[PDB]
Amino acid sequence: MISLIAALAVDRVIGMENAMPWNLPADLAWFKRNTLDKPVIMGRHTWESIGRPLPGRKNIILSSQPGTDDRVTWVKSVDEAIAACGDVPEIMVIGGGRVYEQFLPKAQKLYLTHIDAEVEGDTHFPDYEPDDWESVFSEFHDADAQNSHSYCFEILERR
Ligand SMILES: NC(=O)c1ccc[n+]([C@@H]2O[C@H](COP(=O)([O-])OP(=O)(O)OC[C@H]3O[C@@H](n4cnc5c(N)ncnc54)[C@H](OP(=O)(O)O)[C@@H]3O)[C@@H](O)[C@H]2O)c1
Numbered sequence: 326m327i328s329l330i331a332a333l334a335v336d337r338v339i340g341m342e343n344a345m346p347w348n349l350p351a352d353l354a355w356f357k358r359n360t361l362d363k364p365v366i367m368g369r370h371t372w373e374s375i376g377r378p379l380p381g382r383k384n385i386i387l388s389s390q391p392g393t394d395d396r397v398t399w400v401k402s403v404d405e406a407i408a409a410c411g412d413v414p415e416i417m418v419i420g421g422g423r424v425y426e427q428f429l430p431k432a433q434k435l436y437l438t439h440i441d442a443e444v445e446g447d448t449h450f451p452d453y454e455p456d457d458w459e460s461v462f463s464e465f466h467d468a469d470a471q472n473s474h475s476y477c478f479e480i481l482e483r484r
């Protein structure tokens with residue numbers, strides 16, 4: 326199956342100028358717990374903002390262009406990206422906005438982190454209609470001396 330994972334601020338802001346405007350490490354641990362030993366598909370701008378490969382995962386980059394780094398796999402369409410994952414239990418789509426938009430219809434599960442922050446951004450997660458989605462898990466955390474916002478983890482599965 327295909328799953329999307331994303332961290333959303335208020336009004337579904339997911340980014341600004343390609344950046345990590347928030348250093349919330351509990352959500353990073355959640356991201357790694359849920360993408361470890363799976364293929365991860367990302368768009369080229371998200372690849373350039375991560376800065377490096379994510380180790381322990383098959384990194385597949387969508388770009389209309391050929392490869393600029395042979396440490397990762399390059400694909401030039403959605404059909405090719407899914408094919409390049411091979412037969413697996415779960416394909417993780419890790420953004421960004423343009424890529425989330427395209428894989429939402431082909432998505433059976435959402436891993437969403439909702440962060441209590443406002444950050445005047447320039448990229449937004451898809452405005453699905455949640456009627457098509459059921460929440461199957463919601464785990465809320467208040468701020469700590471390590472994460473300076475409250476956040477909810479949510480898993481949503483297509484009904
Ligand atoms: N908060 C989160 O969870 C989260 C997660 C991921 C990313 N982000 C943020 O999202 C922002 C970047 O998102 P973005 O929407 O600008 O870019 P993106 O989706 O990461 O990448 C867009 C690029 O991917 C390629 N691409 C997309 N669809 C393609 C297709 N069907 N076929 C071939 N190539 C395709 C294209 O590369 P070419 O132009 O080379 O052709 C396109 O320009 C950043 O700010 C990032 O920090 C946030």
Ligand SMILES: Nc1nc(=O)c2nc(CNc3ccc(C(=O)N[C@@H](CCC(=O)O)C(=O)O)cc3)cnc2[nH]1
Pocket residue numbers: 330331332352353354355356357371375379380419420437438
């Ligand atoms: N919930 C969620 N959190 C995120 O941080 C996230 N990030 C992306 C894409 N951006 C990034 C940026 C950095 C790293 C990263 O450095 N990952 C490391 C964590 C650092 C560590 O190992 O301690 C990793 O190995 O997973 C991953 C994805 C997409 N969806 C997400 N979804």
